[PDB]
Amino acid sequence: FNLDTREDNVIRKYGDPGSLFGFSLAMHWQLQPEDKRLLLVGAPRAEALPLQRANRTGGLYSCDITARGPCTRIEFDNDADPTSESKEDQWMGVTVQSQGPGGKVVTCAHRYEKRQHVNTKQESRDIFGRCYVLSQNLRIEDDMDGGDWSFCDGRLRGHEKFGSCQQGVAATFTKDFHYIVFGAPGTYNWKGIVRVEQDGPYEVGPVPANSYLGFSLDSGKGIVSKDEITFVSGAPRANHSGAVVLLKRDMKSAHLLPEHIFDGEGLASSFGYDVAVVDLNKDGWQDIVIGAPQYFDRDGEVGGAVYVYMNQQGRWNNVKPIRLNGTKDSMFGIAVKNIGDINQDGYPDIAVGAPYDDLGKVFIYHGSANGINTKPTQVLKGISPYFGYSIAGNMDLDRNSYPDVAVGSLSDSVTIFRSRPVINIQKTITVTPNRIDLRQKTACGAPSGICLQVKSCFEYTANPAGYNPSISIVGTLEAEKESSRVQFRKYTQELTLKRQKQKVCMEETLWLQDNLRPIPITASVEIQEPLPEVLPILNSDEPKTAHIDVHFL
Amino acid sequence: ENPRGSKDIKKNKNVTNLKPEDITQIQPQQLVLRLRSGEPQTFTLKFKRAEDYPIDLYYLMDLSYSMKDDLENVKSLGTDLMNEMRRITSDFRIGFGSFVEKTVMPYISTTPAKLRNPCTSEQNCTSPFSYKNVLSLTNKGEVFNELVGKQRISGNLDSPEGGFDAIMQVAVCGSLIGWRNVTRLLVFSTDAGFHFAGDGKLGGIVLPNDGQCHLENNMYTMSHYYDYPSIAHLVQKLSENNIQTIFAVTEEFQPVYKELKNLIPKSAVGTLSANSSNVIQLIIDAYNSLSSEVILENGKLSEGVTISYKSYCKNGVNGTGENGRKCSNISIGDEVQFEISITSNKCPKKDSDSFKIRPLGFTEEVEVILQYIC
Amino acid sequence: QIVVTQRPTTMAASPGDKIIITCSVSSIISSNYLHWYSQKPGFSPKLLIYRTSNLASGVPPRFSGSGSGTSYSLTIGTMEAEDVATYYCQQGSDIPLTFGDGTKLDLKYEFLKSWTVEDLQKRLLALDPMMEQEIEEIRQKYQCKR
Amino acid sequence: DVKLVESGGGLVKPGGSLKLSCAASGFTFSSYTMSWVRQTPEKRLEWVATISSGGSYTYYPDSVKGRFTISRDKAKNTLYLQMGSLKSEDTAMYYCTRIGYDEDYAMDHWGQGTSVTVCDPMMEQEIEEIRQKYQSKRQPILDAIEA
Ligand SMILES: *[C@@H]1O[C@H](CO)[C@@H](O)[C@H](O)[C@H]1NC(C)=O
Ligand SMILES: *[C@@H]1O[C@H](CO)[C@@H](O)[C@H](O)[C@H]1NC(C)=O
Ligand SMILES: *[C@@H]1O[C@H](CO)[C@@H](O)[C@H](O)[C@H]1NC(C)=O
Ligand SMILES: *[C@@H]1O[C@H](CO)[C@@H](O)[C@H](O)[C@H]1NC(C)=O
Ligand SMILES: *[C@@H]1O[C@H](CO)[C@@H](O)[C@H](O)[C@H]1NC(C)=O
Ligand SMILES: *[C@@H]1O[C@H](CO)[C@@H](O)[C@H](O)[C@H]1NC(C)=O
Ligand SMILES: [Ca+2]
Ligand SMILES: [Ca+2]
Ligand SMILES: [Ca+2]
Ligand SMILES: [Ca+2]
Ligand SMILES: [Mg+2]
């Protein structure tokens, strides 16, 4: 609820029309040259660079929100050699991923091709794909850093083996800085494989031909074992429904073995287009969120679905999934992302993109102790079509202890939402004559002869710990919801709280009247208040009100 | 004090006992429902199957090299299928289209040598194409034969083929195909799987199919620019143009197309034999099952408004839920009854809004006016 | 049988005038099957527009075709004096092949000297095959009444 | 390039016979569908017969079925229409046409047409009145030219 959508505060950055700026985006934390928080944006149809012999090759951008206006292209891959390769329509920046804070960055071009015997009767074209690793500063400097990753090149050719493997549509780093993971969906007659690199490269060969394994990737410890790493890869074409595979790296061999296989119910549901690893209930066992954008059922009013698989101590066969459904042909679930804990309640949250929900929508779902909360706590909407095709988050951009969310597009735009701090306000209510005695008369001003002094006191707690800001509230006391047996001398006071855990009270006397069942008094608060500043939002997932019943005797 | 819900019938011309636009198969045609929130209304629809309309049959054929021998039995389909369906109608029109795949990598090879002959150099394959409208709908049955015989096989790289791009174009390019306002059968005969939306990312195609017409010189020009259609998109455009679909696929892939058939409302699927030998019988058996079956479907409802269907078919079959939208084993002249209970919960819109009920494959529609009382 | 209906039967216009002629068929045909022909008096028909909107080779850019379903139209962007002829539409979708009854487009000294010199003689040249057509129609009539 | 030349027309007695011929030049004769369209004295186009490029199938309107018969000779590049059991309705100028594409059935080339009719001082008066009719149509243009 706390993503700031006030269009004063919403950050929008644009790119050249036709470049697919915003197709893929990742949060990066550059650390030791300077501490800068960036948002890496892929534009796979970006106009080519001069010495690339192509009309459009794609590139990677880097948007600093602390900086002004246009994002900057990262300069790399200006190579071109017509006798050996082709970068025309190579889709550089089809994916981009951060390794971590101060870590490396991988971006890939999955239609990069390697040619031989050009202009000759024996000309060959192989769509290998290739990947670039960059430093935390977006540059080629270390030796394993930079350069090209094209593991398919040099292995048995033909579409039956590695001829059309198309490495790089999916790529990710394991979070312990140990490995880098590649997806190559064309391998073995479009079976697809996953490749773990940086003891000995581990590959596959699990799923049949024409399944596109390696189309999506995620990884984490705590999927199957709490300190064994598991590789999650979707295969959206498997059996014309889709599937997702949990991959472990074998102790002895250089092979990835399938620990478990989810598969989708719907025909052509693209089950596994995107996967996400997230511990939604924070029970120490990572759960698995799987998107099926083209999910379509016999009735045909749901369009797209997301499958939330709740982990059970690393055992998945008994797990039944919570399925979020999308509106009619909305592509709900083409992007599922672990966005971290945007309201800082202690449970990670997820975002789900639905690019054809009118102009596009991104649904935000809350983590809970009972798993996922199926009702979206916030819905972001786009102002240009196909908003929400890509998401990223789980990094604090403006340094306010709260992670932020960035949403891509097919319309050459990227939108950044920043999280408002969450004020938890505790309410107390004390009516000091606890019980009403109608046979008792008193010197107060009520012609009744009977009065009640109702006092309510407000503290506010908030995350982080040192966040002790000005909060100017408006307390409101009211009684008798629906006759009107009491009346004040609706009471509203305008309060103010200087710092956390410090009470501030308001008090007023309620006059009874002459002519039985308890009176309810309720107190409520509402926050009121005046690169820009985000303002706190009241925690709206706590009770709005505090209540009390005074009982006649 | 208590206003109550009402029903009253505005247009109730009887079922016909004679061009298809003048034939009446469903009655009443228009009524007004006065709805109070929480109270249901309940009217009945009568459907009487008229005698067989004329027939426009478009044959959309997978033209990969695996289908080469199949051409010589379809090459005589124009005259044979017309003489074989005289019983049903003598007003028969037939057309032909063909498809292979999107013309980008990795779905085909783009080396100049393979871009002009995708199959082995012995086989004289033509360059691959997405969708070609060979012969638009006509009764020139012998012309269908001569042209199909002259059609050139071709091929591609991966096994699943892009027939979905062709279906979409056949459904939405009506002015070029020539669909009359009659029985529109679309025969889709392949021997391989199909690509669907989301697969185009491998070829650099991520924009969703826009459901518009992009045929210039009877060829699909934009298979490079739009993804494969979603099934939802296909169902939307297929039903909106009254296209009844006949999947004539080989036994190797019939499971997936029976699953696809269940997602498409007015569609049958039969198992193609070896060399498309049995495709004449396959069509008329699929025609017999589609024409001897009626499935209602209603337009977009304002939210708060529920609609229920209950059906009463021949031999005592009674359908409920989503099967109350359907009745089968219905011969010519048979009549069956539908009960339609619709309920509102709000006072949602200030004034009257109307939706429509229609049997699939027909231009006939029941208009239901909604008025909320409040 | 598909009935092709052409209107107007006749039309009179001036050079710089913009003709719109319509063609309607009893049943829906594909746009690939509707064609237009023109016939200068004293000559044979010549294909003008085929497949609804494609100009035949050697047809000036001022001609244009449009339509779908059952209603099609042929428009002359700005009439020139040579465009005086009768225009036919034809459906090729169904056997039998049927022709419209044709729209006869004609003209209306006062206005004559408005014209270029070459079109006044293009018009003379157009008139002569007109005249011997009528003359030879007579001869055929008279020998068969013999 | 393409030239179609009809001949064989003339005067015929009702119930009689006529055979027409069209000589094709400038294009490969066997590649195309040939047809006969006729124009009546009411200046109306009536499709009369069509034959495939290989001659394996033919189409006729029902008004002429059994009476007329279309054929072609691959070696002589000529198309024939054999007419029988004639009538006054068949009185027409008969054109030879080529169909450029069997996918649309547009007649992209028409011959010059042969005339078929089926059954002095007044003749001259009629004809001379036409030539004075046209002489009076010509004179304003000649006057216009001179100004
Ligand atoms: C579907 O794929 C799964 C896993 O790839 C496999 O278990 C199953 O046999 C497949 N279904 C069919 C019908 O082959
Ligand atoms: C929609 O998803 C809900 C959970 O959000 C689930 O309970 C329900 O089964 C789905 N709707 C269906 C299957 O019609
Ligand atoms: C399909 O047709 C070819 C034609 O030569 C034939 O040789 C082949 O055996 C046929 N396939 C059958 C009969 O299963
Ligand atoms: C391929 O087909 C064409 C069709 O015109 C034919 O002329 C040609 O000879 C064939 N090519 C070979 C190599 O046989
Ligand atoms: C055909 O039906 C459509 C609606 O389905 C209608 O708009 C159109 O006028 C009809 N045309 C003919 C020729 O029947
Ligand atoms: C179906 O319902 C009708 C009346 O609505 C009844 O006569 C008939 O017996 C029922 N059939 C079955 C099989 O329940
Ligand atoms: Ca968990
Ligand atoms: Ca949370
Ligand atoms: Ca933040
Ligand atoms: Ca294919
Ligand atoms: Mg095939």
Author numbering:
A (entry chain A): 1 to 198, 211 to 217, 228 to 504, 511 to 517, 524 to 549, 554 to 568, 577 to 599
B (entry chain B): 61 to 77, 86 to 442
C (entry chain D): 1 to 30, 30A, 31 to 107, 112 to 149
D (entry chain C): 1 to 52, 52A, 53 to 82, 82A, 82B, 82C, 83 to 100, 100A, ...
Quote from the publication.
Integrins are one of the most important classes of receptors that mediate adhesion of cells to extracellular matrix (ECM) components, which is the hallmark of multicellular organisms. Integrins exist as a heterodimeric molecule comprising two type I transmembrane subunits α and β, yielding various α/β combinations with distinct ligand specificity. Laminins are heterotrimeric molecules consisting of α, β, and γ chains and are major component of basement membranes. Recognition of laminin by integrin receptors is central to the epithelial cell adhesion to basement membrane, but the structural background of this molecular interaction remained elusive.
To gain structural insights into the laminin-integrin interaction, we first determined the crystal structure of ligand binding fragment of human α6β1 (α6β1 headpiece). Crystallization was facilitated by complex formation with an anti-β1 antibody TS2/16, in a hyper-crystallizable antibody fragment format “Fv-clasp” described previously. In the 2.89 Å resolution structure, one α6β1-TS2/16 Fv-clasp complex was contained in an asymmetric unit. Four out of the five domains contained in the headpiece construct were resolved, while the PSI domain of the β1 subunit showed poor electron density and omitted from the final model. The β1 chain structure was essentially the same as that in the published α5β1 structures, and the resolved α6 domains (β-propeller and thigh) were highly similar to α5 and other α subunits. The α6 β-propeller domain assumes canonical 7-bladed propeller fold with the seven four-strand anti-parallel β sheets forming the domain core. However, the two loops preceding the outermost strand in the blade III (strand IIId) were disordered. In the sequence spanning K199 to V227, only β-strand IIId, 211DGPYEVG217, showed traceable electron density. Furthermore, this region coincides with the alternatively spliced “X1 region” (residues I193-L235) found only in laminin-binding α subunits, suggesting its possible role in ligand capture and/or specificity. However, we could not see clear electron density for ADMIDAS metal in our structure, while electron densities were clearly visible for metals in SyMBS and MIDAS using a simulated-annealing omit map.
